[PDB]
Every structure is written in structure tokens, then in C-alpha cells.
Amino acid sequence: ATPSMMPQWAYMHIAGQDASEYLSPGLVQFARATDTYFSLGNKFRNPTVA
């Protein structure tokens, strides 16, 4: 809720887009297709903000 600091947080994913919605649409479709044997979940971070 601080407009001054928001761009710095959005870049580092402390508060902003969720991992499923800032990756390229190709990557997120790729990741869920192969999650059975090769997981790309713990790498990209998803923010949570109170």
C-alpha cells in the first residue's frame, strides 16, 4: 500500500503478480504439463501480501 515502493517490490516479487500470471504464457503452460516428473514450482516465487 506504498505507491513509492511498489515498483521495487513488483520487480523482486515481494508483492505483485503471482507466479502463474507473470511468467510467459508458454512457460506456465509448459510447467503444468510436465509437473508429474520435472517440477518448476519451487523456483519461481509467488507473492503473498496481507
Partner: peptide
């Protein structure tokens, strides 16, 4: 109004858990 402003935001959209807001328990 909308009460989504009170829910934690997991990303950009609020969490907003499903319709588990019930209660039903007894010995049966």
C-alpha cells in the same frame, strides 16, 4: 459493496476460500 478487500492476496487476486462455511457434526 465488496468484501474482497478483507481477504489476503495470494498474488494479485484475493484468496477467497471456497464455500466451506458450514458446520455439521454429531455422533451419527
Amino acid at each position: 459493496i465488496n468484501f474482497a478487500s478483507l481477504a489476503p492476496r495470494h498474488g494479485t487476486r484475493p484468496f477467497m476460500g471456497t464455500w466451506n462455511e458450514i458446520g455439521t457434526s454429531q455422533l451419527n
